[PDB]
Short mmCIF file of C-alpha atoms and ligand atoms in Angstrom, two decimals:
data_model
loop_
_atom_site.label_atom_id
_atom_site.label_comp_id
_atom_site.label_asym_id
_atom_site.label_seq_id
_atom_site.Cartn_x
_atom_site.Cartn_y
_atom_site.Cartn_z
CA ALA A 1 0.00 0.00 0.00
CA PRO A 2 1.64 3.24 -1.27
CA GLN A 3 1.88 5.92 1.44
CA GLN A 4 -0.09 8.14 -0.91
CA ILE A 5 -3.07 5.82 -1.00
CA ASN A 6 -2.82 5.32 2.76
CA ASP A 7 -2.71 9.03 3.46
CA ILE A 8 -5.58 9.97 1.12
CA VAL A 9 -7.70 7.17 2.49
CA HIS A 10 -7.02 7.77 6.17
CA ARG A 11 -7.31 11.56 5.92
CA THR A 12 -10.70 11.19 4.27
CA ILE A 13 -12.23 8.22 6.05
CA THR A 14 -11.11 8.99 9.62
CA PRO A 15 -13.13 12.21 9.80
CA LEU A 16 -16.04 10.60 7.95
CA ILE A 17 -16.25 7.88 10.58
CA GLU A 18 -16.06 10.45 13.37
CA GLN A 19 -18.64 12.84 11.89
CA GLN A 20 -21.11 10.08 11.02
CA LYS A 21 -20.53 7.95 14.15
CA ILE A 22 -20.01 4.87 11.99
CA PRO A 23 -19.41 1.77 14.18
CA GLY A 24 -17.51 -0.27 11.58
CA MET A 25 -16.22 0.36 8.08
CA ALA A 26 -14.28 -1.36 5.32
CA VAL A 27 -12.82 0.35 2.28
CA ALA A 28 -11.16 -0.98 -0.88
CA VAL A 29 -9.34 1.23 -3.34
CA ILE A 30 -8.61 -0.25 -6.73
CA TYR A 31 -5.56 1.54 -8.09
CA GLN A 32 -4.00 0.52 -11.38
CA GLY A 33 -5.94 -2.74 -11.12
CA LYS A 34 -4.77 -3.83 -7.64
CA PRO A 35 -6.93 -3.66 -4.52
CA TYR A 36 -5.84 -1.98 -1.25
CA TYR A 37 -7.87 -2.64 1.88
CA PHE A 38 -8.63 -0.66 4.99
CA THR A 39 -10.77 -1.52 8.01
CA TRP A 40 -12.01 0.26 11.11
CA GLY A 41 -14.11 -0.40 14.15
CA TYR A 42 -16.69 -3.06 14.89
CA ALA A 43 -18.79 -5.59 13.02
CA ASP A 44 -20.51 -6.42 16.32
CA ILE A 45 -20.25 -3.86 19.10
CA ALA A 46 -21.64 -6.04 21.90
CA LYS A 47 -19.45 -9.04 21.01
CA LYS A 48 -16.42 -6.78 20.33
CA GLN A 49 -15.90 -8.31 16.92
CA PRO A 50 -13.74 -6.13 14.63
CA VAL A 51 -14.33 -5.37 11.01
CA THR A 52 -12.01 -7.46 8.91
CA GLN A 53 -11.57 -8.14 5.20
CA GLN A 54 -13.86 -11.17 5.82
CA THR A 55 -16.73 -9.23 7.42
CA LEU A 56 -20.06 -9.46 5.56
CA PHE A 57 -22.01 -6.21 5.04
CA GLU A 58 -25.51 -5.73 3.68
CA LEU A 59 -25.13 -4.14 0.27
CA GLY A 60 -28.69 -2.92 0.04
CA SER A 61 -29.31 -1.43 -3.37
CA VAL A 62 -25.77 -2.09 -4.57
CA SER A 63 -27.44 -5.52 -5.14
CA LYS A 64 -29.15 -3.89 -8.13
CA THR A 65 -25.80 -3.91 -9.91
CA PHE A 66 -25.65 -7.71 -9.58
CA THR A 67 -29.24 -7.96 -10.84
CA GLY A 68 -28.45 -5.73 -13.80
CA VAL A 69 -25.40 -7.79 -14.74
CA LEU A 70 -27.31 -11.10 -14.33
CA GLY A 71 -29.95 -9.68 -16.66
CA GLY A 72 -27.28 -8.52 -19.08
CA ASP A 73 -25.86 -12.05 -19.05
CA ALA A 74 -29.32 -13.47 -19.89
CA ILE A 75 -29.63 -11.04 -22.81
CA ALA A 76 -26.19 -12.06 -24.07
CA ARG A 77 -27.25 -15.73 -23.88
CA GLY A 78 -30.28 -14.93 -26.05
CA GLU A 79 -32.64 -15.92 -23.22
CA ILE A 80 -34.36 -12.53 -23.04
CA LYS A 81 -34.35 -9.21 -24.88
CA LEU A 82 -34.87 -5.85 -23.19
CA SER A 83 -37.31 -5.07 -25.96
CA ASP A 84 -39.50 -8.02 -24.84
CA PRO A 85 -42.90 -7.17 -23.29
CA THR A 86 -43.09 -8.02 -19.58
CA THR A 87 -46.04 -10.26 -20.43
CA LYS A 88 -43.82 -12.57 -22.53
CA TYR A 89 -42.37 -13.88 -19.27
CA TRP A 90 -45.43 -13.42 -17.10
CA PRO A 91 -48.48 -14.15 -19.25
CA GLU A 92 -50.71 -14.12 -16.13
CA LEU A 93 -50.13 -10.36 -16.09
CA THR A 94 -53.23 -9.73 -18.18
CA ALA A 95 -54.31 -6.30 -16.98
CA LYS A 96 -54.30 -3.75 -19.81
CA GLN A 97 -51.88 -1.25 -18.30
CA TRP A 98 -49.06 -3.75 -18.96
CA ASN A 99 -49.35 -3.41 -22.74
CA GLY A 100 -46.25 -1.55 -23.80
CA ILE A 101 -44.20 -2.12 -20.61
CA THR A 102 -40.96 -3.90 -21.57
CA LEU A 103 -38.16 -5.52 -19.62
CA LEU A 104 -36.10 -2.36 -20.34
CA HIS A 105 -38.71 -0.28 -18.52
CA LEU A 106 -38.61 -2.58 -15.51
CA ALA A 107 -34.85 -2.65 -15.32
CA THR A 108 -34.48 1.14 -15.58
CA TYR A 109 -37.41 2.35 -13.40
CA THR A 110 -39.23 3.78 -16.40
CA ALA A 111 -42.38 1.59 -16.44
CA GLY A 112 -44.61 4.46 -15.38
CA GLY A 113 -44.24 4.75 -11.63
CA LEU A 114 -44.08 1.24 -10.24
CA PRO A 115 -44.18 1.57 -6.44
CA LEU A 116 -41.02 2.17 -4.54
CA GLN A 117 -41.67 -0.79 -2.24
CA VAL A 118 -43.50 -4.06 -2.58
CA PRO A 119 -45.83 -3.92 0.44
CA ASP A 120 -44.82 -6.06 3.44
CA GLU A 121 -48.26 -7.69 3.21
CA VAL A 122 -47.31 -9.31 -0.08
CA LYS A 123 -46.08 -12.75 1.05
CA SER A 124 -47.31 -15.23 -1.60
CA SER A 125 -46.80 -15.57 -5.36
CA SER A 126 -50.51 -14.84 -5.85
CA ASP A 127 -50.08 -11.76 -3.64
CA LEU A 128 -47.36 -10.58 -6.03
CA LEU A 129 -49.53 -11.06 -9.10
CA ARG A 130 -52.45 -9.17 -7.46
CA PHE A 131 -50.09 -6.31 -6.61
CA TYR A 132 -48.82 -5.86 -10.15
CA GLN A 133 -52.25 -6.47 -11.70
CA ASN A 134 -53.87 -3.81 -9.51
CA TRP A 135 -51.15 -1.18 -9.80
CA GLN A 136 -52.26 1.93 -11.64
CA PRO A 137 -49.45 3.63 -13.53
CA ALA A 138 -48.99 7.29 -13.03
CA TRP A 139 -47.45 7.79 -16.50
CA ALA A 140 -46.96 6.19 -19.90
CA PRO A 141 -43.94 3.90 -20.07
CA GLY A 142 -40.64 5.45 -20.97
CA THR A 143 -41.43 8.98 -19.89
CA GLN A 144 -40.28 9.32 -16.24
CA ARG A 145 -37.81 7.61 -13.96
CA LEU A 146 -38.93 6.67 -10.47
CA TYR A 147 -36.36 4.63 -8.59
CA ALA A 148 -38.20 1.60 -7.22
CA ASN A 149 -37.60 -1.88 -5.80
CA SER A 150 -40.80 -3.23 -7.38
CA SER A 151 -39.46 -2.29 -10.84
CA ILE A 152 -35.91 -3.72 -10.93
CA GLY A 153 -37.02 -6.50 -8.57
CA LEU A 154 -39.54 -7.76 -11.12
CA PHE A 155 -36.95 -7.42 -13.91
CA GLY A 156 -34.59 -9.74 -11.97
CA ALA A 157 -37.27 -12.33 -11.37
CA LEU A 158 -38.36 -12.40 -14.99
CA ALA A 159 -34.88 -12.30 -16.49
CA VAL A 160 -34.01 -15.67 -15.04
CA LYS A 161 -37.25 -17.45 -16.05
CA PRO A 162 -36.00 -18.95 -19.36
CA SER A 163 -32.89 -20.33 -17.58
CA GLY A 164 -35.14 -22.58 -15.49
CA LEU A 165 -33.05 -21.59 -12.48
CA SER A 166 -34.14 -19.76 -9.35
CA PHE A 167 -32.86 -16.19 -9.11
CA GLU A 168 -30.36 -17.23 -6.44
CA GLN A 169 -29.12 -20.27 -8.37
CA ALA A 170 -28.75 -18.18 -11.51
CA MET A 171 -26.83 -15.48 -9.64
CA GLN A 172 -24.57 -18.08 -8.02
CA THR A 173 -23.77 -20.09 -11.13
CA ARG A 174 -23.64 -17.25 -13.66
CA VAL A 175 -22.15 -14.34 -11.71
CA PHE A 176 -20.76 -15.13 -8.23
CA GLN A 177 -18.98 -18.38 -9.07
CA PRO A 178 -17.29 -17.36 -12.33
CA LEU A 179 -16.01 -14.14 -10.73
CA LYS A 180 -14.81 -16.08 -7.66
CA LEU A 181 -17.07 -14.09 -5.34
CA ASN A 182 -17.04 -16.93 -2.83
CA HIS A 183 -18.09 -14.86 0.17
CA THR A 184 -21.04 -13.12 -1.45
CA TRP A 185 -24.49 -14.34 -0.52
CA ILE A 186 -28.15 -13.78 -1.08
CA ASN A 187 -28.70 -16.00 1.99
CA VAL A 188 -25.90 -16.12 4.52
CA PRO A 189 -25.12 -19.80 5.25
CA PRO A 190 -24.83 -20.87 8.91
CA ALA A 191 -21.10 -21.46 8.37
CA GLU A 192 -20.60 -17.80 7.51
CA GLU A 193 -22.81 -16.21 10.20
CA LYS A 194 -19.78 -15.51 12.41
CA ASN A 195 -18.70 -12.98 9.79
CA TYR A 196 -22.04 -11.22 9.27
CA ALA A 197 -21.82 -7.74 10.76
CA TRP A 198 -24.73 -6.24 12.64
CA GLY A 199 -26.20 -3.07 11.23
CA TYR A 200 -26.91 -0.19 13.59
CA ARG A 201 -29.99 1.99 13.46
CA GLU A 202 -30.57 4.42 16.31
CA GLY A 203 -28.03 2.39 18.26
CA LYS A 204 -29.92 -0.90 17.82
CA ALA A 205 -28.38 -3.95 16.11
CA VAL A 206 -30.43 -4.81 13.01
CA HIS A 207 -30.43 -6.99 9.91
CA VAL A 208 -32.51 -6.57 6.80
CA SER A 209 -35.90 -8.31 7.00
CA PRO A 210 -37.20 -10.80 4.40
CA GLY A 211 -39.50 -9.32 1.73
CA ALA A 212 -40.88 -10.13 -1.70
CA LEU A 213 -38.31 -9.57 -4.44
CA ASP A 214 -35.65 -8.86 -1.83
CA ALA A 215 -32.83 -10.84 -3.41
CA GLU A 216 -33.46 -9.10 -6.71
CA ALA A 217 -33.49 -5.53 -5.37
CA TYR A 218 -31.56 -5.22 -2.08
CA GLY A 219 -30.65 -8.59 -0.55
CA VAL A 220 -26.96 -9.27 -1.24
CA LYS A 221 -24.29 -9.45 1.47
CA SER A 222 -20.61 -9.36 0.68
CA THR A 223 -17.11 -8.74 1.97
CA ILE A 224 -14.76 -5.93 1.08
CA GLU A 225 -12.52 -8.43 -0.85
CA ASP A 226 -15.39 -9.73 -2.95
CA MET A 227 -16.63 -6.19 -3.57
CA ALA A 228 -13.17 -5.15 -4.71
CA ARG A 229 -13.25 -8.08 -7.14
CA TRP A 230 -16.71 -6.97 -8.33
CA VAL A 231 -15.30 -3.51 -9.04
CA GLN A 232 -12.29 -5.03 -10.86
CA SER A 233 -14.67 -7.13 -12.98
CA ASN A 234 -16.78 -4.12 -13.87
CA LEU A 235 -13.68 -1.98 -14.64
CA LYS A 236 -12.22 -4.55 -17.04
CA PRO A 237 -14.94 -6.89 -18.37
CA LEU A 238 -12.67 -8.12 -21.17
CA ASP A 239 -10.56 -10.03 -18.66
CA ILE A 240 -13.62 -12.17 -17.93
CA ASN A 241 -13.40 -15.60 -19.56
CA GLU A 242 -17.11 -16.38 -19.63
CA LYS A 243 -18.26 -14.69 -22.85
CA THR A 244 -21.87 -13.94 -21.92
CA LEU A 245 -20.88 -12.56 -18.54
CA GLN A 246 -18.32 -10.25 -20.15
CA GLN A 247 -21.07 -9.04 -22.48
CA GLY A 248 -23.56 -8.79 -19.58
CA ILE A 249 -21.27 -6.44 -17.68
CA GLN A 250 -20.91 -4.28 -20.76
CA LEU A 251 -24.66 -4.17 -21.23
CA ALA A 252 -25.24 -3.06 -17.66
CA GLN A 253 -23.00 -0.01 -18.25
CA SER A 254 -24.77 1.00 -21.43
CA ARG A 255 -26.59 4.35 -21.23
CA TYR A 256 -30.34 3.83 -21.72
CA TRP A 257 -31.89 7.07 -20.37
CA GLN A 258 -30.69 10.50 -19.35
CA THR A 259 -31.98 12.60 -16.43
CA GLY A 260 -29.97 15.76 -15.88
CA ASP A 261 -26.33 14.76 -15.97
CA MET A 262 -27.00 11.12 -15.07
CA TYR A 263 -27.38 8.13 -17.32
CA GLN A 264 -29.26 5.02 -16.23
CA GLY A 265 -27.73 1.58 -16.91
CA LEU A 266 -28.88 -1.80 -15.65
CA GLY A 267 -28.31 -1.32 -11.95
CA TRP A 268 -25.32 0.94 -12.50
CA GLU A 269 -25.74 4.69 -12.93
CA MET A 270 -23.21 6.77 -14.80
CA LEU A 271 -21.99 10.30 -15.39
CA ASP A 272 -19.39 11.58 -17.85
CA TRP A 273 -15.92 11.96 -16.32
CA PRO A 274 -14.63 14.43 -15.30
CA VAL A 275 -17.70 14.93 -13.21
CA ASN A 276 -18.65 17.94 -11.17
CA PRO A 277 -18.64 16.50 -7.62
CA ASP A 278 -21.77 18.52 -6.71
CA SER A 279 -23.36 17.09 -9.85
CA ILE A 280 -22.94 13.53 -8.61
CA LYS A 281 -32.88 13.05 1.81
CA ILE A 282 -35.61 12.71 -0.84
CA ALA A 283 -37.81 9.68 -0.27
CA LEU A 284 -39.32 9.69 -3.79
CA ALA A 285 -38.12 11.69 -6.81
CA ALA A 286 -39.93 11.59 -10.15
CA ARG A 287 -37.86 12.85 -13.07
CA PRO A 288 -38.53 13.06 -16.78
CA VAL A 289 -36.18 10.92 -18.83
CA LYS A 290 -34.81 11.29 -22.32
CA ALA A 291 -34.34 8.08 -24.23
CA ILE A 292 -30.89 7.40 -25.60
CA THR A 293 -31.78 5.99 -28.99
CA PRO A 294 -29.98 3.61 -29.37
CA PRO A 295 -28.27 3.15 -26.00
CA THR A 296 -24.64 4.20 -25.85
CA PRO A 297 -22.26 1.34 -25.23
CA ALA A 298 -20.26 1.57 -22.03
CA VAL A 299 -18.27 4.81 -22.00
CA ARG A 300 -14.81 4.30 -20.51
CA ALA A 301 -14.65 7.96 -19.51
CA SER A 302 -17.44 7.62 -16.92
CA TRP A 303 -18.00 7.88 -13.20
CA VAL A 304 -19.92 4.65 -12.72
CA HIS A 305 -21.51 4.19 -9.30
CA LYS A 306 -24.26 2.93 -7.04
CA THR A 307 -25.33 3.75 -3.51
CA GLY A 308 -26.88 1.14 -1.23
CA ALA A 309 -28.72 1.34 2.06
CA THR A 310 -30.60 -0.94 4.36
CA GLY A 311 -31.91 0.04 7.79
CA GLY A 312 -28.54 -0.69 9.33
CA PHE A 313 -25.99 -0.39 6.51
CA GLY A 314 -24.65 2.14 4.05
CA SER A 315 -22.65 1.10 1.00
CA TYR A 316 -21.12 2.85 -1.98
CA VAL A 317 -19.27 1.71 -5.10
CA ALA A 318 -17.74 4.03 -7.71
CA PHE A 319 -15.24 3.47 -10.49
CA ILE A 320 -13.78 5.14 -13.56
CA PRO A 321 -12.88 2.62 -16.29
CA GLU A 322 -10.60 4.98 -18.25
CA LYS A 323 -8.41 5.39 -15.12
CA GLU A 324 -8.56 1.78 -13.87
CA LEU A 325 -9.59 3.31 -10.57
CA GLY A 326 -12.37 2.42 -8.15
CA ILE A 327 -13.51 2.41 -4.57
CA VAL A 328 -15.86 0.42 -2.33
CA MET A 329 -17.05 1.81 1.01
CA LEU A 330 -19.02 -0.56 3.27
CA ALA A 331 -20.36 0.61 6.60
CA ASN A 332 -22.73 -0.78 9.23
CA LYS A 333 -24.67 2.43 9.63
CA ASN A 334 -26.85 4.04 6.95
CA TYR A 335 -25.38 7.54 6.82
CA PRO A 336 -26.14 10.28 4.27
CA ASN A 337 -25.35 9.63 0.61
CA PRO A 338 -23.69 13.01 0.02
CA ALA A 339 -21.04 12.12 2.60
CA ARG A 340 -20.34 8.87 0.72
CA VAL A 341 -19.95 10.58 -2.62
CA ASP A 342 -17.83 13.42 -1.24
CA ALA A 343 -15.48 10.92 0.39
CA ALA A 344 -15.21 8.72 -2.69
CA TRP A 345 -14.61 11.70 -4.92
CA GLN A 346 -11.94 13.13 -2.64
CA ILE A 347 -10.10 9.78 -2.73
CA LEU A 348 -10.40 8.99 -6.45
CA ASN A 349 -9.70 12.55 -7.57
CA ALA A 350 -6.44 12.49 -5.60
CA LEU A 351 -5.29 9.25 -7.15
CA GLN A 352 -6.36 10.10 -10.67
B1 25N B 1 -31.56 0.84 -1.97
O1 25N B 1 -30.53 0.55 -0.94
O2 25N B 1 -31.31 2.22 -2.42
C1 25N B 1 -33.01 0.72 -1.35
C2 25N B 1 -34.01 1.56 -1.83
C3 25N B 1 -35.30 1.53 -1.23
C4 25N B 1 -36.39 2.50 -1.76
C5 25N B 1 -36.68 2.15 -3.20
C6 25N B 1 -35.92 3.93 -1.76
C7 25N B 1 -37.66 2.42 -0.92
C8 25N B 1 -35.57 0.66 -0.16
C9 25N B 1 -34.57 -0.20 0.34
C10 25N B 1 -34.85 -1.16 1.53
C11 25N B 1 -36.09 -2.00 1.30
C12 25N B 1 -33.66 -2.06 1.89
C13 25N B 1 -35.07 -0.27 2.74
C14 25N B 1 -33.30 -0.15 -0.29
#
């Protein structure tokens, strides 16, 4: 670890941890391809367990990047197309508002205002169908972006249907295993529980609760080493030996819609680099989108990123392919997103 990387990381993260009262944190910087790791504080305060490079954190919505890449892999295999109607994979979805809503719309939050959350009351498969049947779109498809778990969650579930595999099995065999993410889990096995950090919300130890379409939208747990490898894989997809996965990664970084300075991929979100740091709180934010017709293939000169939160955890991943540079920040408190971005930008800008 170069003293430069050490100094920029410690001078940025130490005050962040102090200001935000973060109990435990792990950081990976990917610099010229190699990962450098840093850890602070506690995975479990009461049991005095430290954060290590083996600690599991809830990724929250950073899981959407795995879903987007799994869907990209299914497209590359010829199993699905983003131009396919939703009803091709869910014919039971007969209500008329679904005519015109494609897998692209689901993946990119542009279906017309699918709800932010699947209600907790939805517990059965028939509950799920009722929910989507009864939903009344606010808008025509492809006109506004409304970030939503019920949108990308449904995309993940449908994308794996032609494979015959469960979502989890598909993710494991097609993404986690080939990339050697061997400590990344949709369900944490009993053998690995010793490494699962607690999250902290108002000083209480918490873990994310089960919900419909959780795995697809917010349910992955991972370590800082596996997350560094995920960043490496998304920085340099051509190093990946599995052809459809390499292609899937590229598809997830394609630019499908534009809102302001941001471009929506599959899971990933992107801005042109160099990026105004202030250009990189609100519970619900509807924004008109412009279609990118046709989508732009992955731009190397991009700030590519994704925030994640659960009740107890705050995560952030950002990378710049043209500079072979990236960062992962995993914490067991959900602290404000602007603090994540400011920290990540301070670190990557200094190393770029
Ligand atoms: B994700 O970590 O950004 C994410 C988003 C949401 C919205 C869509 C904002 C309600 C909800 C969650 C959970 C369900 C984990 C709180 C996560």
